[PDB]
């Protein structure tokens, strides 16, 4: 980060263009009270909610420990401009729900062995609740590829060949029955958010997040891996 919302809005597009400052989340000023702060209990409208990751770890199927990864797709992995609702109770319990906005970004990383691991970074339909220092929840992870995506041999779920066009002699291809079927089914993930600062003067919040989800499976043709994503987040309450 290292820039606030006002500082970001004080620039020009030609000054931000190319500097990778559009892939970052704003931080709060010195007026931000620590913890939950002085927020009046109630339900607020969430706006400008963004999450900037700071590390990716991959646990290959068959391993019990996460591993570091190297990003391959440059600065395209920040979710931003999401909108929703935030409710604060008198005790301190808070509930966060995400409705719209850019809440998904495909990401590809490489691991120690040299295997590229695509995954679908998203917090779509986020539903978390808990205290200020911890918010456990879940989200839905849509398929990496759509139903109309066609594989290199022209096989797709809702459009494409249902078999292998090249192997004409093999009438049924019972050996290839596994790869001829495509399913774009969705899955779910888990999240654990936290709140570190809050400014009731302008209705701004910030904290950290840790999420766990699954990598892609090439439309049901692979065993997905588990990926842990951690970083910071920011949002505005109004």
């Amino acid at each position: 980060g290292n820039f606030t919302f006002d500082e970001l809005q004080a620039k020009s597009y030609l000054e931000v263009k190319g500097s990778t400052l559009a892939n970052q989340c704003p931080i709060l000023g010195a007026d931000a009270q620590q913890g939950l702060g002085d927020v009046k209990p109630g339900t607020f409208q969430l706006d400008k909610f963004c999450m900037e990751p700071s590390s990716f770890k991959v646990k290959m199927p068959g391993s019990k420990e996460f591993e570091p990864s190297t990003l391959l797709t440059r600065n395209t992995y920040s979710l931003d401009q999401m909108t929703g609702s935030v409710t604060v109770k008198g005790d301190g319990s808070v509930a966060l729900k995400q409705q719209d906005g850019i809440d998904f970004a495909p990401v590809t990383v490489k691991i120690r062995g040299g295997e590229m691991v695509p995954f679908m970074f998203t917090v779509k339909n986020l539903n978390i609740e808990g205290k200020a220092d911890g918010l456990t929840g879940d989200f839905t992870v849509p398929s990496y590829r759509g139903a109309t995506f066609m594989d290199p041999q022209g096989r797709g779920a809702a459009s494409g060949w249902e078999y292998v066009k090249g192997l004409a002699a093999a009438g049924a291809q019972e050996e290839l029955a596994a790869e001829n079927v495509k399913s774009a089914a969705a899955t779910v993930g888990e999240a654990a958010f936290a709140i570190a600062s809050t400014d009731a003067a302008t209705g701004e919040i910030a904290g950290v997040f840790v999420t766990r989800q699954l990598a892609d499976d090439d439309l049901g043709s692979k065993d997905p891996a588990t990926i842990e994503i951690e970083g910071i987040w920011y949002g505005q309450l109004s």
Partner: protein, 102 residues
């Protein structure tokens, strides 16, 4: 509709006795008007190994309609010689090719 000699791959369409299309295996399954699932086509075998056996599962019906393009459906042993699955040519073709070049 039987697959002509020219085509390496041919679409699967089903015609009635008047030559009008009635069913096919669609490439774009978002909207379909002659889909086998819609029409409800079934296959029955007369004579041979599968005499008297009727298949109504759409996947099996599609699989058998795919092999009807090649002509008479047969049973092959693709394990003795590890056949890859692409058609070859006969001594007729080899002789003709070699002697034209010569």
């Amino acid at each position: 509709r039987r697959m002509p000699t020219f085509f390496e791959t041919f679409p699967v369409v089903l015609l009635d006795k008047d030559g009008v299309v009635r069913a096919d295996v669609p490439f774009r399954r978002s909207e379909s008007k002659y889909s086998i699932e819609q029409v409800g086509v079934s296959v029955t075998f007369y004579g041979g190994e599968l005499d008297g056996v009727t298949f109504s599962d759409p996947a099996t019906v599609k699989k058998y309609a795919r092999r009807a393009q090649l002509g008479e459906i047969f049973e092959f042993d693709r394990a003795t010689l590890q056949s890859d699955g692409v058609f070859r040519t006969s001594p007729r073709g080899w002789f003709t090719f070699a002697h034209l070049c010569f």
